[PDB]
Design a protein around this ligand. Structure first.
Ligand SMILES: [Ca+2]
Length: 401
């Protein structure tokens, strides 16, 4: 009864991308059941807006109790910032993965220098309307979160202001890719399994992977409503242990063929396994005359990366997401300063539960010693010191503060 979950049921949402792997694998390989969570429903969300709506509603209303999220969605939902004032407190419990994301660009931009560092192509992009009849058009999957941040960082590092120099919009992924085929979309912030299809089907090329923009960067996370977690503490830790074991399992190369087979199944991603076999080996055809990537360390990682533990949710990473939100002037009234950002993080990030769950499960040797992963370094040399986010913001060339 000590480890017995208060309830064996929970509804967790996911989006059909590699970031969802730990949830799918924990369920399909019996890791959730091992700890008593035999009633986990891994529910596919139609899109990010729908996932947001479903967690706001909650399972009792026909929605979800938590799930996979781009950052800082849990924080924004907790503060009612993206729910029209409906504050639904949530807890960030674990990071699901790092990498497995990238930026794609249309073929018409090849030989223009639109690669990892777009500095030399800045003027080309900025004057696209006069030369090509329209503003450079790029898209993400939901505003103010991960993909938006990745493409914005990429543009801004090369001298392109994502708010004034281009048309950065939120567009469905299928509509976005179709746009690239039609010659109306110039680039988009995506992730696996999308890159493979884009390059193999000559829809475009890969300007760069997020693994190149910020090696081992924080990515998507598991977050559950605070009311559910507060009511079911034992069940919450059981879920964490199941996820941790699944992450460890996924990172063993020997299990990746099965991982790919399972997630690509009809009842999940529903896509040909061939489009994910390469990424899970760290293999990517970049195109545009650039060398292909062949490095396991540059593909998706779920348990351990080159810096620290992937799963442990470092508060310094929540801090970067809120600091970058401030950089772009997002939620000007709700998050007006870094102090407010830290207060939100202390209410949302529950790294303490991750530590507790890891300890009980026997993973003490993998627990990071600090809540900070230290100074972070981006591909353009900019560094983020969690101890001084103000200095990070001031070191950036393009920003709204
Ligand atoms: Ca992502």
């Amino acid at each position: 009864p000590e480890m017995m979950p208060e309830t064996a049921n929970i509804k967790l949402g996911y989006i059909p991308i590699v970031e969802a792997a730990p949830l799918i694998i924990a369920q399909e390989k019996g890791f959730f059941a091992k700890y008593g969570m035999t009633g986990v429903e891994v529910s596919k969300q139609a899109n990010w807006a729908s996932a947001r709506d479903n967690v706001t509603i909650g399972s009792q209303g026909g929605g979800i109790d938590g799930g996979q999220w781009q950052m800082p969605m849990p924080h924004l939902i907790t503060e009612g910032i993206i729910t029209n004032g409906n504050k639904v407190p949530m807890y960030v419990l674990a990071q699901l993965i790092t990498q497995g994301n990238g930026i794609a660009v249309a073929p018409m931009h090849e030989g223009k220098g639109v690669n990892l560092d777009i500095t030399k192509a800045a003027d080309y992009i900025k004057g696209f309307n006069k030369t090509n009849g329209r503003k450079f058009k790029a898209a993400h999957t939901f505003p103010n979160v991960n993909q938006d941040f990745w493409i914005r960082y990429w543009f801004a590092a090369g001298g392109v202001d994502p708010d004034t120099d281009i048309d950065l919009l939120a567009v469905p992924p299928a509509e976005t890719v179709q746009g690239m085929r039609n010659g109306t979309m110039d680039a988009f912030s995506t992730g696996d399994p999308w890159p493979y299809r884009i390059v193999t089907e000559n829809i475009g090329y890969m300007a760069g992977l997020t693994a190149q923009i910020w090696p081992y960067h924080p990515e998507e996370y598991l977050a559950i409503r605070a009311d559910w977690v507060d009511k079911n503490p034992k069940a919450t830790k059981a879920l964490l242990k199941g996820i941790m074991e699944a992450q460890q399992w996924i990172d063993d190369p020997k299990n990746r063929p099965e991982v790919v087979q399972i997630v690509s199944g009809r009842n999940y991603f529903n896509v040909p396994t061939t489009i994910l076999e390469s990424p899970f080996k760290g293999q990517y055809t970049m195109g545009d005359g650039q060398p292909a990537i062949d490095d396991f360390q540059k593909g998706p990682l779920y348990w351990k990366d080159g810096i620290g533990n992937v799963s442990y949710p470092y508060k310094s990473h929540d801090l970067w997401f809120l600091t970058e939100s401030i950089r772009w002037g997002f939620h000007k009234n709700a998050i007006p300063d870094l102090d407010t950002a830290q207060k939100i993080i202390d209410k949302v990030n529950r790294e303490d539960l991750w530590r507790e769950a890891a300890t009980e499960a026997g993973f003490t040797a993998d627990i990071p010693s600090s809540t900070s992963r230290g100074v972070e370094t981006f591909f353009d040399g900019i560094t983020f010191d969690p101890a001084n986010p103000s200095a990070y913001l001031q070191s950036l060339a393009i920003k709204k503060v």
